[PDB]
Amino acid sequence: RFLKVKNWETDVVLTDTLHLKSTLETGCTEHICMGSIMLPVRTKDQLFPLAKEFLDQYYSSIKRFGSKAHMDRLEEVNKEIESTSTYQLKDTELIYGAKHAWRNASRCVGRIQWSKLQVFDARDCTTAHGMFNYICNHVKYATNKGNLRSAITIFPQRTDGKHDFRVWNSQLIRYAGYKQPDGSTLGDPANVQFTEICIQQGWKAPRGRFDVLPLLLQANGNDPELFQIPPELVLEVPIRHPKFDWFKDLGLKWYGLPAVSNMLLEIGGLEFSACPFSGWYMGTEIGVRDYCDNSRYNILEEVAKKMDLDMRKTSSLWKDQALVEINIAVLYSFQSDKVTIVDHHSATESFIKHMENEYRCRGGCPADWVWIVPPMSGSITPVFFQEMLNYRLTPSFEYQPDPWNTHVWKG
Amino acid sequence: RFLKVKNWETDVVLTDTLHLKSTLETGCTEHICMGSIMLPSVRTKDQLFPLAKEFLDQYYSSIKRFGSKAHMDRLEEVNKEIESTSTYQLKDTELIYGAKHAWRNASRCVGRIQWSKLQVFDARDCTTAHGMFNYICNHVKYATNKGNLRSAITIFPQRTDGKHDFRVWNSQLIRYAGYKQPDGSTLGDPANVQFTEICIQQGWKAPRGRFDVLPLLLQANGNDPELFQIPPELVLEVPIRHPKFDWFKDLGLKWYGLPAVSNMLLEIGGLEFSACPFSGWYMGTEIGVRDYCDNSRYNILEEVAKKMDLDMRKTSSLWKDQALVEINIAVLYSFQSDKVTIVDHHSATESFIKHMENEYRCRGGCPADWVWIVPPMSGSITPVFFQEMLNYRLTPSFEYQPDPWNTHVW
Numbered sequence: 001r002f003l004k005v006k007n008w009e010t011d012v013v014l015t016d017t018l019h020l021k022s023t024l025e026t027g028c029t030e031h032i033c034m035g036s037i038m039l040p041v042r043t044k045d046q047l048f049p050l051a052k053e054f055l056d057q058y059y060s061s062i063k064r065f066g067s068k069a070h071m072d073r074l075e076e077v078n079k080e081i082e083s084t085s086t087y088q089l090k091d092t093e094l095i096y097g098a099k100h101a102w103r104n105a106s107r108c109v110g111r112i113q114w115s116k117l118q119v120f121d122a123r124d125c126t127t128a129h130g131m132f133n134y135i136c137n138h139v140k141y142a143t144n145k146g147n148l149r150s151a152i153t154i155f156p157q158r159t160d161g162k163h164d165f166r167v168w169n170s171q172l173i174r175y176a177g178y179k180q181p182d183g184s185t186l187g188d189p190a191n192v193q194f195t196e197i198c199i200q201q202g203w204k205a206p207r208g209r210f211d212v213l214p215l216l217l218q219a220n221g222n223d224p225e226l227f228q229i230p231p232e233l234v235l236e237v238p239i240r241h242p243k244f245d246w247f248k249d250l251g252l253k254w255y256g257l258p259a260v261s262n263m264l265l266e267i268g269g270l271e272f273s274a275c276p277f278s279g280w281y282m283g284t285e286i287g288v289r290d291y292c293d294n295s296r297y298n299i300l301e302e303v304a305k306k307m308d309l310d311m312r313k314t315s316s317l318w319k320d321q322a323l324v325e326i327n328i329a330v331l332y333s334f335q336s337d338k339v340t341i342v343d344h345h346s347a348t349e350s351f352i353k354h355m356e357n358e359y360r361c362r363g364g365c366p367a368d369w370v371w372i373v374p375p376m377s378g379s380i381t382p383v384f385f386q387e388m389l390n391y392r393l394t395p396s397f398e399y400q401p402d403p404w405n406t407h408v409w410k411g
Numbered sequence: 412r413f414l415k416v417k418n419w420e421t422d423v424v425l426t427d428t429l430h431l432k433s434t435l436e437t438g439c440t441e442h443i444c445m446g447s448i449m450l451p452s453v454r455t456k457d458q459l460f461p462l463a464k465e466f467l468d469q470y471y472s473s474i475k476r477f478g479s480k481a482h483m484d485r486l487e488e489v490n491k492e493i494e495s496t497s498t499y500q501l502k503d504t505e506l507i508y509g510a511k512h513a514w515r516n517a518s519r520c521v522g523r524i525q526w527s528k529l530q531v532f533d534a535r536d537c538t539t540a541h542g543m544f545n546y547i548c549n550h551v552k553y554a555t556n557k558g559n560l561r562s563a564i565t566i567f568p569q570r571t572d573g574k575h576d577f578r579v580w581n582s583q584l585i586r587y588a589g590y591k592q593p594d595g596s597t598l599g600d601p602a603n604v605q606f607t608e609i610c611i612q613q614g615w616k617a618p619r620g621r622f623d624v625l626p627l628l629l630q631a632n633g634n635d636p637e638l639f640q641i642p643p644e645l646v647l648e649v650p651i652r653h654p655k656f657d658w659f660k661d662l663g664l665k666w667y668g669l670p671a672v673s674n675m676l677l678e679i680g681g682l683e684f685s686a687c688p689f690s691g692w693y694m695g696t697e698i699g700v701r702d703y704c705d706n707s708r709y710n711i712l713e714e715v716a717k718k719m720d721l722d723m724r725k726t727s728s729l730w731k732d733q734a735l736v737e738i739n740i741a742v743l744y745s746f747q748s749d750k751v752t753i754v755d756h757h758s759a760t761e762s763f764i765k766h767m768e769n770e771y772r773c774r775g776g777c778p779a780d781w782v783w784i785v786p787p788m789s790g791s792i793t794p795v796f797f798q799e800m801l802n803y804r805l806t807p808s809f810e811y812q813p814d815p816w817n818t819h820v821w
């Protein structure tokens with residue numbers, strides 16, 4: 001069975017056959033589309049075929065399908081599963097799985113880079129202090145003094161679900177948010193709940209406006225522990241505007257390194273619940289979302305007020321105007337400081353090239369249009385006109401519940 | 412079974428039960444989501460009666476006479492008519508209800524808060540293209556209303572056996588001509604390049620300007636289509652100027668006030684109305700973001716950025732974005748100065764969030780296609796960006812249909 005997607009700006013038509021390797025559910029049915037819905041331990045029983053399918057992919061990629069090495073690995077894994085109820089990945093398999101999890105992330109517009117991932121094997125880690133060391137080395141490597149480098153650090157896989165490794169932060173670097181008694185918020189409104197957990201865990205909060213949060217790190221199912229990232233490792237960029245001299249006076253800055261730390265990496269049925277990964281920013285993830293969301297820094301009003309816009313009626317598009325200016329400043333600031341960043345025009349253009357190349361050599365490229373189209377100026381980017389098929393391939397990155405909702409406290 | 416939709420800006424969570432009355436197919440499976448695919452790539456007496464019963468059932472429910480004397484009698488009456496004639500005819504009240512609810516059920520339409528205010532023009536007695544023309548002129552005049560735009564639909568005879576179809580060949584009743592240049596570029600509107608040529612291919616006398624209003628190409632009862640020129644005094648146009656830059660007028664832009672879709676099919680109780688032009692009023696981004704700044708449309712993006720003297724060498728200057736905003740400020744300012752109805756994308760999306768809440772409250776759901784509801788600019792500063800939506804097909808409905816120049820036996 002062969003499916004087709006059409007680009008409505010260029011009439012280019014591609015043919016998807018990779019969807020035949022799709023596995024778990026999309027959430028949709030013949031009677032409902034859940035395409036705009038954000039969200040949805042293993043027995044040897046269902047683990048055997050999950051491992052086999054992964055190894056079949058792996059040995060196909062290295063042109064060794066059905067080789068003696070393939071069959072011995074199959075036999076050795078299945079023996080390990082039935083005698084221990086799980087199995088260990090080789091280094092080679094682990095690297096392959098992490099890269100392919102990214103290659104399969106249908107919501108990620110940056111996947112053109114998927115094969116250039118630095119994989120740090122932290123599966124020998126045993127304590128939160130060890131996790132801290134591993135994460136410090138990741139941040140230093142990835143940052144690279146502003147010449148950012150994609151990377152992932154993989155902590156031990158889940159066993160019985162009672163000994164999980166977890167990074168409680170949603171991203172490795174993020175600013176605190178403080179709800180004031182009068183109802184206003186100091187800092188990042190998105191991080192108010194997590195900031196409270198940290199303060200309750202004993203974090204002495206400076207209660208400034210751009211306080212980097214501590215790492216809250218859980219090893220082997222023990223209670224999590226607080227660590228402060230050394231400030232010399234946290235690269236930051238003061239935000240200024242190339243024409244508006246008053247923009248610096250807003251006093252804004254943003255960190256350089258986007259590092260997702262709350263997701264679950266699934267490879268051959270194995271679940272890696274702590275796997276921070278990092279790349280580099282698209283400008284709009286700071287300037288459209290991290291300041292101008294009604295639920296974030298809401299400098300949207302202030303920028304408009306200082307541009308002296310008509311804020312009486314929305315049809316003056318004063319919100320749209322200030323939104324553009326803030327995104328110009330973010331890109332200008334990062335480039336001036338030689339900190340890697342990509343604007344949404346370059347990133348979407350690169351993704352279309354990636355997507356076409358993937359249809360050629362792979363038979364498809366799963367993609368979530370709802371997330372691929374940028375949060376501003378959508379229809380002047382080339383992905384807006386691009387039909388996209390969405391399906392789940394494994395290995396994959398998955399959401400997992402917040403650990404504070406599931407953790408059993410030791411005391 | 413009782414699905415939940417969350418708004419991630421407000422944490423409001425609505426429960427959808429209306430989807431259980433869904434019917435047609437989405438295109439998706441549990442293995443593959445086609446939510447970003449544009450398109451879905453006569454009735455026999457047995458297929459027809461359940462469809463009619465379903466519709467009559469929801470009609471008599473809406474007037475709180477479900478299972479009443481009138482209900483069962485009407486149910487029986489249509490049963491007899493179908494067994495006899497192999498089709499049936501709608502009562503005027505049912506026709507009006509069906510059309511309003513096809514609008515209410517249009518999951519790609521952000522403007523649905525107004526759905527119950529539709530003016531329905533019953534044109535089922537029409538027999539000829541001249542008659543169609545008359546009905547369409549009256550529609551345009553009524554809908555335009557001197558700039559105080561009013562939603563309207565005109566419904567021509569339903570399909571019978573597929574041979575005697577009524578079709579408006581134009582995709583919209585009012586559209587600007589587009590001619591390809593003997594060398595490279597395009598004059599007018601490139602989306603209409605084929606149509607603008609099909610008209611001359613039939614006998615049009617193209618004034619060969621940029622903004623030449625296309626003639627109507629009306630097909631009645633399956634015969635060859637006929638050209639008609641809409642009296643220009645019926646075509647309200649707004650000159651586009653900017654509330655700042657006076658060079659903006661120099662661009663010499665204008666757009667028509669009346670968006671009027673005319674190539675879709677309306678399905679009520681199993682019956683198919685192949686010619687059912689409907690109109691409302693524009694959202695500002697439909698003209699400026701899409702009609703002006705699309706690459707394959709007017710593409711004056713470069714001109715506007717050039718006249719703003721913006722750095723156009725690196726994309727990271729966001730010069731396209733900057734120009735795009737100013738163009739959409741001008742469109743809104745121009746319509747508003749001329750007292751021609753228009754809504755900005757902030758107002759329309761806010762209105763739609765309110766409409767959603769109303770529908771979940773008094774109806775149990777609201778089918779909605781996020782890929783189409785989110786505006787093509789400034790998406791994440793509008794309330795619909797963070798609103799999860801469930802998409803499903805209810806009937807009565809508006810459906811796509813092939814272009815008649817492939818279908819018609821000339």
Ligand code: HEM
Binds near residue numbers: 110150282371397
């Ligand atoms: C290297 C430059 C990268 C860029 C420019 C980029 C860009 C983006 C953007 C804009 C999103 C949308 C998320 C949102 O709006 O909240 C996203 C999502 C995502 N990216 Fe990438 N990304 C990059 C690197 C990576 C890497 C290194 C990985 C994994 C190894 C990755 C995996 C993902 C995943 C799993 C998502 C899903 C997010 C979710 O579901 O919330 N990305 N990316």
Ligand code: HEM
Binds near residue numbers: 809
């Ligand atoms: C009164 C003001 C109205 C507004 C502001 C409005 C707004 C919109 C917009 C922005 C779209 C997106 C379509 C596109 O981008 O091409 C749309 C789609 C649609 N609207 Fe509305 N609309 C209005 C009135 C109506 C009426 C009166 C009807 C029917 C009686 C209707 C039915 C539809 C349908 C069927 C679609 C889907 C179009 C398609 O599938 O291509 N609308 N609407």
Ligand SMILES: COc1cc(N)nc(CCc2cc(CCN(C)C)cc(F)c2F)c1
Binds near residue numbers: 260277281289
């Ligand atoms: C792994 O590397 C990545 C690089 C880039 N650019 N984006 C992502 C997506 C994940 C991600 C999303 C957001 C959006 C913030 N919402 C609250 C509005 C901010 C981030 F800081 C971040 F990290 C990952």
Ligand SMILES: COc1cc(N)nc(CCc2cc(CCN(C)C)cc(F)c2F)c1
Binds near residue numbers: 672691692694697
């Ligand atoms: C029936 O009433 C309606 C009112 C409004 N505002 N929109 C529609 C959808 C039909 C429609 C949509 C668009 C979108 C911009 N494209 C250039 C991509 C432009 C139109 F010119 C038009 F006609 C119908």
Ligand SMILES: C[C@H](O)[C@H](O)[C@H]1CNc2nc(N)[nH]c(=O)c2N1
Binds near residue numbers: 783
């Ligand atoms: C490929 C994609 O589905 C296609 O370009 C859609 C996207 N969303 C849209 N949204 C609106 N309002 N109008 C459109 O024509 C489209 N086109």
Ligand SMILES: C[C@H](O)[C@H](O)[C@H]1CNc2nc(N)[nH]c(=O)c2N1
Binds near residue numbers: 036037373375797798
């Ligand atoms: C409700 C909706 O699915 C939700 O707000 C999504 C929509 N698209 C998005 N797209 C991006 N890039 N990032 C997001 O957080 C979201 N949020």
Ligand SMILES: [Zn+2]
Binds near residue numbers: 028029034
């Ligand atoms: Zn779907």
